[PDB]
Amino acid sequence: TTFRFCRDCNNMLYPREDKENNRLLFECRTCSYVEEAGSPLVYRHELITNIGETAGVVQDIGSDPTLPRSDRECPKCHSRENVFFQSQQRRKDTSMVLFFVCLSCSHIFTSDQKNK
Template sequence: MSSPAASASGDGKKKAEQITFRFCSECSNMLYPKEDEAQRKLMYTCRTCNYSEEATSFCVYRNVLNNASGETAGVTQDVASDPTLPRAKQTCPACNHTESVFFQSQQRSAETGMKLFYVCCNSDCGNIFQ
């Protein structure tokens, strides 16, 4: 069972419903979701003054996971000075410096495989290449 707001687009993709905080109209404190067991309804209730209103949406929490991080996420120019990383005689395509450090792709999926990334050790460059 889906709500009209959840499937507003006709292409089969669900549009994420906006979740907002609700505040009491009497004392301005935050309203919290609570089930009215007698009427079997979702209500938003103030914990201070017991004000209550019926929920307009059944979604009270949504956790959105974003796993589209880049293969070289978190890599900075400081990586070149890290003594724990292995070094290679790989020429940088940007500045022709002949020393670089390398590491394996941090993205764990079948399509990335064993990709190696090189970071130029020239302090003025810091280019990341494969």
Template sequence: MKTISQVYSLHVTINNMLYPKEDKENRILLYACRNCDYQQEADNSCIYVNKITHEVDELTQIIADVAQDPTLPRTEDHPCPKCGHKEAVFFQSHSMKAEDAMRLYYVCTAPHCGHRWTE
């Protein structure tokens, strides 16, 4: 992300800030003084970038009804860390991030629990 000093230039002769302005006819970006007619062409046509990253906790994306899915494998080797119930369904899922490896997700099959975890 650019700093304010990288976005706005300075009109050195009268010590005023120059503001981004579009030259629609020539399709270029200019920096213009608001107090006089001084203008200069911008070095870069991008004046601002707003990058938004949305990270969602993968465990919250697991549907609670997955514990009743008869097609999922079940295990008694990984008891629920929340309620201690011995049975859990599990499945393998991959992250949307390329750097993350595949991992197993577990869901407690106890009707009163439904806790989700990964190891």
């Protein structure tokens, strides 16, 4: 995660192990620029995800006519005008929880009960 690019080379910095100072540096297999490892974690794989559950929530989601309105009150705004929609993770196993969006604070909440 969090790729790093070079400068004056701009390619992406692979990690090159420093054993002597004994830490991780990021090389640049084209121009020899280097720097540290801002964190020893290198790679993630992320089988079961929980992102895209709010894909493209723009400040205009309130301006889309086709989205179903709903009346519940935002925990923050305590306003009762909010559009909502299922989780945008277009995949089969996906749950059927609801993401609301208050038209006032643009705060996102959920209809959940298992985990908020």
